[PDB]
Amino acid sequence: SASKQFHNEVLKAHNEYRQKHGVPPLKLCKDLNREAQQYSEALASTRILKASPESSRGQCGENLAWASYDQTGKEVADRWYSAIKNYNFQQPGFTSGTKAFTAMVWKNTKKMGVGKASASDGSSFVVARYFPAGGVVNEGFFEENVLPPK
């Protein structure tokens, strides 16, 4: 299906970048797909483009993406990865402008899910969920989980 293709494309792109950053692949998780899909549908209804409540996604991280057209899996992953531009490997740690990249490559994250919903205006809202959550702000965590590119 279109949904299965989109999931696989997002995952394959994540795993390419994870290999470049020396960490193991992610696997897709059906329940994470379903929760991501649910939030993508909420976004396509309300258009309120901001992170879901933490309480709604026990222990998961999140990435979001929007465009005025139907987004491909590769596009979404490449655009999240591009946040690497703001990351300084000599100063490991959380910043908002790098979260989309650090979530993708976080060593200890094992599984992901992704969803996408169209709005009536033709735009699409995409949500990815990561388990266990990455980017936890604790001394040593970023240096151990966000590795430089090969």
UniProtKB/Swiss-Prot annotation:
It is found in: Golgi apparatus membrane. Keywords: Coiled coil, Golgi apparatus, Lipoprotein, Membrane, Myristate. Residues 88-95 are annotated as: Interaction with CAV1. Pfam families: CAP. Residues 27-50 form a coiled coil. GO terms for molecular function: protein homodimerization activity. Its main location: Golgi. GO terms for biological process: positive regulation of epithelial cell migration; positive regulation of epithelial to mesenchymal transition; positive regulation of ERK1 and ERK2 cascade; sexual reproduction. Residues 11-129 form the SCP domain. GO terms for cellular component: extracellular exosome; extracellular space; Golgi membrane. It is a lipid-anchor. Highest expression in lung and peripheral leukocytes, and minor expression in liver and kidney. It comes from the Eukaryota. Residues 1-18 are annotated as: Disordered. Belongs to the CRISP family. Homodimer. Interacts with CAV1. This is Golgi-associated plant pathogenesis-related protein 1. It comes from Homo sapiens (Human).
